[model samples]
Target chain A: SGFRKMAFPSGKVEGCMVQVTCGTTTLNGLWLDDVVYCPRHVICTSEDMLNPNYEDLLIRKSNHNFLVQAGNVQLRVIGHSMQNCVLKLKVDTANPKTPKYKFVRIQPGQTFSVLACYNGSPSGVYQCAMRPNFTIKGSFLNGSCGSVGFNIDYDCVSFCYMHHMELPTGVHAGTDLEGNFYGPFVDRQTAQAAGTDTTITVNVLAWLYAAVINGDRWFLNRFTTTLNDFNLVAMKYNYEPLTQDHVDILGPLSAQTGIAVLDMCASLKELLQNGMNGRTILGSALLEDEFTPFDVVRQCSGV
Target chain B: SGFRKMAFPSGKVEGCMVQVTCGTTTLNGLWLDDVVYCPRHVICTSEDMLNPNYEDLLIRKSNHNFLVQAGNVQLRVIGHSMQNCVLKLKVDTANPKTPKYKFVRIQPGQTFSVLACYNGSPSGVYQCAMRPNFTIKGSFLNGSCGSVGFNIDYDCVSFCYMHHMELPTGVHAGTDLEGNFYGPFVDRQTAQAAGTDTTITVNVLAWLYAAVINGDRWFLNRFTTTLNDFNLVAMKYNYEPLTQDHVDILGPLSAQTGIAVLDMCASLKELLQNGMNGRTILGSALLEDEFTPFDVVRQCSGV
Candidate 1:
């Protein structure tokens, strides 16, 4: 009826006619964007999904209206994204020699993009065949990268200082009393700003913009390629206080700081997606507000 | 030595200093504030110091600033709602004597209240002893008899037709035609809104508030007390079709379209302080946009 969250049982007749529709119209075309269909469905981690069903036997749609029918049925058109758009579907029906299906204008709204049956289970081989308009003639490489390249993963981390660690109780064991304990090097203003309820979004472009330009003095040194670079930055900020046995044993820098650790470690996920380049972008993303594209050359150049 | 966080070894000379001021000025006066001054110069609970030393005490202060000196000191203060204040010490220096002191100030803020010692013992009990500028002190008391008050925790639950179950990805079990099967009512919207990120705030007020006003629909039933009351609202909006077996497996009368058990039950800290009434206020505070006090009462009253 609608975009079914569950799939039908397997072992069904291979050539059975399946009609894809939404509400009433047999929506033979649809679109989806920025979403990973893949190897990711139920499959997790770097491995698994050795040979995935790229064409989930399901259909996709975008922000516009669409209706396509192969035979006697069609599924409901459902789902949306604010900015980008796309749709997807899986088809296992009689080919051209058997039936000539025609698409009809079902629901009316924005007449934009529509993608059709992508590569399905011949397994192993991956391809995407899309039809932007209502045109039938389209090639495999349309609307999809012919073959995405495999690259080294990137590392992402987001760390906040004591001021940023505003737990509910306000001040717990000890406060920065007079706030001057850290001395001249520490940027106390930025540190104090993080104590309240505030969200800092990190995107690659924005992060790079800040890190390289010291926009907010929030730089990235921990995840750098060189340990020396990290040490230098740390030294500039009077890292001794952080490394002090007392602080190491009690402050937020202590290994037990659960929330901080999770935030710092979460960036690894994105790094795995786009690899090293992606990690560098993520480093910037953690510093910036919007999703910014990476300046591939500059990022690739060692810092 | 400098707002230090050093761990000191326990000794006879130790006292919590529960919270003390060296007395910056005579106007500020030395306030033991019922602070227990045990024999070893150790100060315990604020209650301990009440009668000049006892036990368990609670002294929550906003800003604690004080001054200290060696001998004969006088105290001065002002404020309304002043009563239980005390101090303990020794007096007489060379000769032993039961210290006696008196306090009578023209205004609440102009009174000097200090605790001195006669040969290492309380010289005298320091009282608030102050006269208000507005002469007559007004007092009111309301006493009533009623049945023994008892609190029973309750759970809040809601039900909907199985058709309304919007399963995410693989949350559903067996396969059915896209719109065929429905039953499990996992809280997808809430799970997403609560984003795997973000800690759930404990709402002691919401729990008590719900109990006071009966119940709030926004409060998760499963995560609250067992003292629940259920009533039929309306299920017409949930227009999804449910299979017979689905209704049979999940009792139709008591089935929830979806259940969003919150993380409230996880902690009992705040609950101990304010009970359910506090929970209601706390709940409202936790979620800024959802459940405001004004509109919350309306929702609780089933408006």
Candidate 2:
């Protein structure tokens, strides 16, 4: 019922978008988090030590479906720590959202863009849920993992996620632990420590009124853009509150300066509708003739 | 005696802003009612054949005060059967306003900048006296000679003499033929026979008020510029002739389009001051802004 509450498919929420994917081509029961388990200090060396600056490794693959690929993926590994890390991946099947989605295993010093397939307009909120842990005997040794989160508020969308690491108190869900876990399974305490990788799950949601401009305005225009509703501000709504005197000056100034107050008001209205702050909404050159542009008043914006 | 009536000193004036050493200068005298007399069939020969081009033959410097130069001068011998050709000469001295001016002999075709100096602030009316002729003795079929006459109107303040061969036929201050005389001097018959070198005199007063905007607002500002009555067109003045409605639209129109009413007023005033008629000055961007300039509707003085 609260704005920030998360929902699941089989739970209370409906009409939301979702996606699930895997990292490889075939559905083999010997896949990760299922059949083969990785244990701590178990460094699996590659067939031959690759060149110092090697780029990609070769893998044998043909199919693009896997029962071991979707929501049930266990990102933790314990024994197959270093060289025999996940070489090939299996594709995610069954999930209609991203049925053909595939995943990749990251190397020690590699970077990549994590692509998420979700249903809903690009205007919807999206997030990734990840957990980092260690595993062996095809089973999770401990659920001590780390996770990260992201959000899309309005038309001006952002999709970059925050990196986190496991908490010292082991705060992975369903695991007996405490303390908040923050991103990135970097074994900074020890050099190249094995058996610690994060599990990250993605989430997407389409809201009737997200904490964004369009959502704020959609409700505010009904109550009027100038309403001083505390609830609205708590929800991050933005609109310019004009005094009667401000309205009066517009006509004369426009006559003398060749601009109409209505035009300025409309411009301000549009900016607020697009989710600008109330303070950022007023004193714009769009409204006042004497307003210096972004270049002159740059210090004010913390630019 | 008002701003319009300023008097000229002597009949000549000269001043140099910058100087060129050894740069010979000449003052041209326009004899208002003069006649040039060369025998009908006399073949003129050059005394100074080195400068055969007549243009440089303005005035020949002979001695200390420049009387006549010998070698590089040209002589064009054209006999006007009508006998009353215009006798023109260039004043060869830097100072020609005094009674003792240099009387040099000018040979043939030469050009010079007859100084056009305004006696006062170049903003008024003036009176000038007649210019004297050069005292010279010619060797006719050889030495049997008669002399031609020249007349002029000199401005005493700036020693610029008016040089018009055709006398303004209204009044003759003297019949001795040495002073100012007004007459349509040479008829077509006498001009055809006695071939006069008709002259034209241009004064700075001629183009005083061309394209000027006159008003207390622009001209009566703190910045004062010297002006003359001739430059003052006494038109009907209006400080705030525009209505509120007009001011509303015109303010924006000028800012947006940059078209000012004063610009058009300047052009209209020019055509009116040029002695042309039938140019109407009516209608305006604002009905309330309508008012005639001094040139269009002005107050008249009575004696």
Candidate 3:
């Protein structure tokens, strides 16, 4: 049983105070929440399509009724997909280690309520056993299982399947599970055809992180927008990703400056460096000294 | 004639060197250009209106060929407006110390062209004589008529009528014969109707000055936007002058904060104080270390 402690700064955890300072400049007393440290190894895939080896999995619970069942276990799999998938449960605190309760003849899309509890704490764990005919793709209980605590590694494995998926070979970038299967080169082939290198995966992740910390809705929206249908080498920069909206507004300037899609970021950097003192603030000018992502968009686009 | 030498730093004026430092922080090697100081007394007037006592006047010239004629003057009135209004010119540097020329009956919309010269220069001045009839509301020549110079005090006069007009009584504020007469409030009555006071005039001017030096197209466009139709008390503040667009986006926040238009400025101030070290840097940001006007607008508006 792998377990880790979860702790949060006191006061409030949902959207808490954020402070950043550099050199003689100090930015303090800002508000932020849901801060998650995204590990670099997280995987993304094209959302509209999935690898054949993956399948959906869901973990759920009803009540602590297993004590009344024969041998303290009652499991069932109802209907659908690869048949003969069995499930088992064990109460780790029970004397004799509670012979592993097993259910045979479990089918896909089935349901079973097992309330295996040891000392009233449910053992804070669940384990699954099944034939290797198919793999679990995703799960409904990954983040929404119960009110109790669980470790990320253990919880990801027991509650959800598809924990070991890797980026398909030769594909440098793909959409996050939460966003659209969109961006230049929607398919791995197109991205590879366009010579996208593995470095782009790193760049994309870094870009996402920056956007998240900045609350850059505009930048996020570009990838999430369904209208995107193409990719170009000019969109490589992390500072300004090319989008249809950008081309429409900066078409002339792009041609004039010979920078193409990257011109917006360059022009903006120039403007900010020359006029704004190299700081980006968005929100209330007199309140917080930061620029909104969309603000830069509008200013740079002049639209 | 008034003449003065002009001087500037050696760098090309397009975008020249700018530097700012505070305590241990320093912003250096930035660029700026065309920094102009706006005097508070500069005037403004509502579009489509004029001062009653203002009338047109023009200073003229005569060619060396004109002095060959008796009295050293020849007068003629061209077509349009009244047919009888005539004009004449004379070149100084003649005997009697300087030459004198006279004209009469210059009617509204009449036209004339004269060649006046003394030595290689045109005396760098012009004087006009006319009865109170038509006023040159504006001149293509006020800043363009001669090559040498005119005293700022005097140039703002004779070349354009309505020079002495102050913010008219009962009128809250107006454009100063310059800048777009197009803000949330376009006229004094409308501004007053919305509870806007004289202080708003002062604040608006200061804000405009800041925006201009910084090339803040966002703020400049707000006032120059022909789409504006009404005014509101929310525009009283120096930060966010409430516009229809603003209310549309911030309507909910306004209700939640118990501050309608004022919420914008308040939110911006809060953000700036919290994030930007409480400095309003205009003219050049990267050069001087301050927030651009649009930076504040974007951060505060989220748009």
Candidate 4:
């Protein structure tokens, strides 16, 4: 219950938005607690690990009646852990308040997905549970095992896009649960881990929130990040070389001094700070402005 | 100037406590901006990329007079980036204010070191500067080039030591700029990048603080972290298996339901929340409570 607590500013939690493309219509869903709540009609299926062509892959409905019982939607296995694991789901929402579900094994290398609602307007929340020990007999944890655990990787939507022939296609970007950006990306190079020099690249998408100033009646003076909870100790980014696109826009944005990098960082910070005197914008580097990340302070909930 | 502004509680910044064992004496130093400030002497050196031995390796002082002129101390290269580079130092601290310094070239595959301050207290603040483009003329950036740049890795100190070392001895731990923990560890497996199935492990150290309860009048009911700024969003640790040492001290400390991990996370959250009821201690997992991390919140200086 505490986890699903939504907010006013950030809108939805990160990873809350789930968009599924089935046949012709696209469904927009919200991940509530363990389940993805959708409008109506949900569908689930397994992924063909070997299939690289996503659009052409066989997309089907799960035989699990609860998926249909909960209404129509969709979910799929993005990736599977090598460990033997089974995912239990509260796929049925007919009970409204307390809907008890069943257990189902998610085999390794099995590509699976599920859909609940058809299009929009979230109406139901499904629960997903992972068991480290899937019992030699079935659901038993007979022995003390160091099962590292299992993870279910799947695809999500992203807003940023860039193309570079030298870069790998399996790019992942970080996202604010409430924003459109999703940092989780599908790693298409699973088999590469088996190779020695077969370089594995996990592309991370990045973005900067520029703090621009115009009508001072008041957006506030000091620059800030997209999320700057209470301002005491603000986050910072490095002054790395901006890409051509960023350069084209922030150009003019840019340090390390004898040490070009040092001189650069120094000069850059100066520019950012000075730019704030009367500015277009401010961000780190002094032009400045950053998350409610893992808690470190014993401020709010002990969590 | 801004980056060096360290202070109150957690005392010396994270990497500040540089303990260099020179012969019989160990020198405790502080990292100020670019240089490591020591009491009497400081030593600087480059690591023999192939040397596995630490104590046995040749430990010597730099030929640079500024080293002796600045006073004796110690410094060494822990690891080197695969880029050609040079490190310049303002080794002379006698000037107190502005001391003009010179550039020194650090050769490839070289094992070098410099030493000053044999004991402690903290005196001189040595300056180190690195140039991305070391002149081919030598110090020159030359025609536009995609020189990726260089890095000089070095060793530091840490308080916590756990050796599963099933776990690599090169375990790195995260630290607050004001704490004694040092996340940077010497990565010894450089040549392994050549192997096919070679597994290169970079160890990371971990720790947690227990938020305990006592006289109701209170040290403040809500649990907190070592560096919780302004109470809004406190940091948290996970409900992991405690080591024998930890368990011995907090035996009673302890989750999951059908799916162990989920049930675990959920149950853990419950234990943590319920533990707040008036318990012995509260850390992560209900009973209790827990940096100026990178800023995401748009509340402070943009940078």
| Candidate 4 CAPRI level | incorrect
- Tell me the TM-score of each prediction against the true structure: 0.16, 0.15, 0.17, 0.20
CA displacement after TM-score superposition, residue A292 of candidate 3 (Å): 19
Candidate maximizing lDDT: 3
Give residue B214's lDDT in candidate 1 (0 to 100): 33
Q: Which order, best to worst by TM-score?
A: 4, 3, 1, 2
Better of 2 and 3 by TM-score: 3
Give one digit per residue, the lDDT tens place, for model 4 in B35-126.
43322212222454333332333234332322211224454422211111111222222222212222223321111111111122121111
Cα lDDT tens digits, model 3, A1-303, are 000010110111111112211122211111111111110111122342332221232112211212212122322212212111111222222222211121133222111111111112121111111111121111111111111111111112011111111122311121121211212323222212322221121122222222333333232222221222223222332222344653554344335333334423333333223433333322112111112222222222322
Model 3 — interface RMS deviation? 34.9
Worst 10 residues of 1 chain A by lDDT: A1-10
In model 1, which runs have C-alpha deviations exceeding 4 angstroms?
A1-303, B1-87, B90-217, B221-303
Which run of 10 residues does model 2 chain A get worst, by summed lDDT?
A: A6-15
Candidate 2 CAPRI grade: incorrect
Worst 10 residues of 2 chain B by lDDT: B294-303
Global local distance difference test of model 2: 0.20
lDDT tens string, model 2, B1-303? 001111211112221111111113221222121122221111112333222222233233111222121112222212111212222222232222133222222211111112221111011111222211211111011111111111122221211222222212111111111222123322111221112222111111111111111110221112221122212431222122222333233333234334343332343234334422322111111111111121111100100
Tens digits of per-residue lDDT, candidate 4, A98-209, equal 1222222332111111111122222111111111111110110101011111111112222111100000211111111122111122223233211111100000011111
